[PDB]
Design a protein around this ligand. Structure first.
Ligand SMILES: NC(=O)c1ccc[n+]([C@@H]2O[C@H](COP(=O)([O-])OP(=O)(O)OC[C@H]3O[C@@H](n4cnc5c(N)ncnc54)[C@H](OP(=O)(O)O)[C@@H]3O)[C@@H](O)[C@H]2O)c1
Ligand SMILES: N[C@@H](CCC(=O)O)C(=O)O
Length: 416
């Protein structure tokens, strides 16, 4: 099972639901540019090691491509291509003037020192400089990359560019000291919370006082639970990590659970709470369930047991298509993954706008703009869901691919 083949299959199953020409589909099934480079760095012991780096630009009909950089030992070209393809639809569904992009280096950064990490970031920029830029390709943080590496990459790009333009805007997720944007740390969770609120409004539910269960307690899951409790007024009854789950009918305080996890490395054995595991955690009687962890967690094995009225897929592809079916005929509103967690890329777009313009916004302005963007995206996807009587993930694919196809036709790339 190849990641890129899965992405192409999903695109074809989507195209089954819309009027798109075969030449446009063939165009969309292939990345428009793939760059594979050697990334040589000098190790701390004095030797030179060469790493493999990627930069895939799937499509740029709608504007400059956008996508993060992953530093993973299991990184492959096919994974980067699939993620760039998904980034295209992610920026299209939330209506950004972006295409799809993705980069990566096959490296285990946990065994690299800080100096070696900086050398790796600078060497990656020196290798891929010719295909990136503020108006060509804007990288961002991803798995095992963080704002510190983003700042190193921006500095190297500015050094090569000789400060002839907005070098701050070449890469997003930067520290606030150098062109960073406010509200970027809790972007994904804020977008997920906005989508959950709109979904509840669509379903006729006032979320104040009902239960939410969150799986995965990284930055996405923890902030999802926290913002749910404050903004949506819901009760957080269950959380879990890479070890096990903790459940409390009376409600868990996300700050205390985060303190527990930091102190002991796991959320397990939290005071006044029943210790459980992920598999039985997935089926608590809650109004909202937010899987925010590893992929492929809801499957036909346990899809029928799911009892959440709203499922918000913060993670990337937590739900299999079959589970999508059973969840649909069960009567449950699923927020598609690349619509639910599109808040991060939206706030990255806001950061890029601030960098390009040279004028920086406040927390309130970023928050309000993100609210409007995410509300509009959710409502367009839901209206397509109603009108075409398709699954809501298929509606998200219809919206995104329709936008990209229109942009491609407008440029004259495809004549039909
Ligand atoms: O960026 P980001 O913050 O969203 O990513 P992230 O920080 O890597 O978030 C990963 C979260 O999902 C959890 N996780 C990873 N694999 C899991 C698995 N197989 N089952 C259950 N939870 C898993 C992690 O647990 P741990 O942090 O405990 O590893 C962590 O809570
Ligand atoms: N990668 C995150 C969610 C997606 C994102 O951060 O964009 C996770 O697996 O929890």
């Amino acid at each position: 099972i190849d990641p890129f083949e899965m992405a192409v299959k999903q695109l074809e199953r989507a195209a089954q639901y819309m009027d798109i020409s075969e030449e446009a589909l063939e165009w969309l099934k292939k990345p428009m540019r793939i760059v594979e480079v050697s990334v040589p760095i000098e190790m701390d012991d004095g030797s030179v090691k060469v790493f493999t780096g990627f930069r895939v630009q799937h499509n740029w009909a709608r504007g400059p491509t956008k996508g993060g950089i992953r530093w993973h030992p299991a990184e492959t070209l096919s994974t980067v291509k699939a993620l760039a393809t998904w980034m295209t639809w992610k920026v299209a569904v939330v209506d950004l003037p972006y295409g799809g992009g993705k980069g990566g280096i096959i490296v285990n950064p946990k065994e690299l020192s800080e100096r070696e990490q900086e050398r790796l970031a600078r060497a990656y920029i020196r290798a891929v400089y010719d295909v990136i830029g503020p108006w060509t390709d804007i990288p961002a943080p991803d798995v095992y990359t963080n704002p510190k590496i983003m700042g190193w990459m921006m500095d190297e790009y500015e050094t090569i560019m000789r400060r002839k333009g907005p070098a701050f805007g070449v890469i997003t997720g930067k520290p606030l000291s150098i062109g960073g944007s406010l509200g970027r740390g809790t972007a994904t969770a804020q977008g997920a919370i906005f989508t959950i609120r709109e979904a509840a409004k669509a379903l006729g539910i006032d979320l104040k006082g009902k239960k939410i269960a969150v799986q995965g307690y990284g930055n996405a899951g923890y902030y999802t639970a926290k913002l749910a409790k404050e903004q949506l007024g819901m009760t957080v009854v269950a959380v879990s990590d890479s070890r096990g789950g903790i459940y409390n009918p009376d409600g868990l305080d996300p700050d205390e659970v985060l303190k527990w996890k930091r102190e002991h490395g796991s959320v397990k054995d939290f005071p006044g709470a029943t210790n459980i595991t992920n598999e039985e955690l997935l089926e608590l009687e809650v109004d909202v369930l937010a899987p925010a962890a590893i992929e492929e967690v809801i499957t036909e094995k346990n899809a029928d047991n799911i009892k959440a009225k709203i499922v918000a897929e913060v993670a990337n592809g937590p739900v299999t298509p079959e589970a999508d079916d059973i969840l649909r005929e069960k009567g449950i509103l699923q927020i598609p993954d690349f619509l639910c967690n599109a808040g991060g890329v939206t706030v990255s777009y806001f950061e890029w706008v601030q960098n390009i313009n040279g004028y920086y916004w406040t927390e309130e302005e970023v928050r309000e703009k993100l609210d409007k963007k995410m509300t509009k995206a959710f409502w367009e996807v839901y209206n397509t869901h109603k009108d075409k009587n398709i699954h809501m993930r298929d509606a998200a694919y219809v919206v995104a691919v329709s936008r990209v196809y229109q942009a491609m036709k407008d440029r004259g790339w495809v004549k039909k």
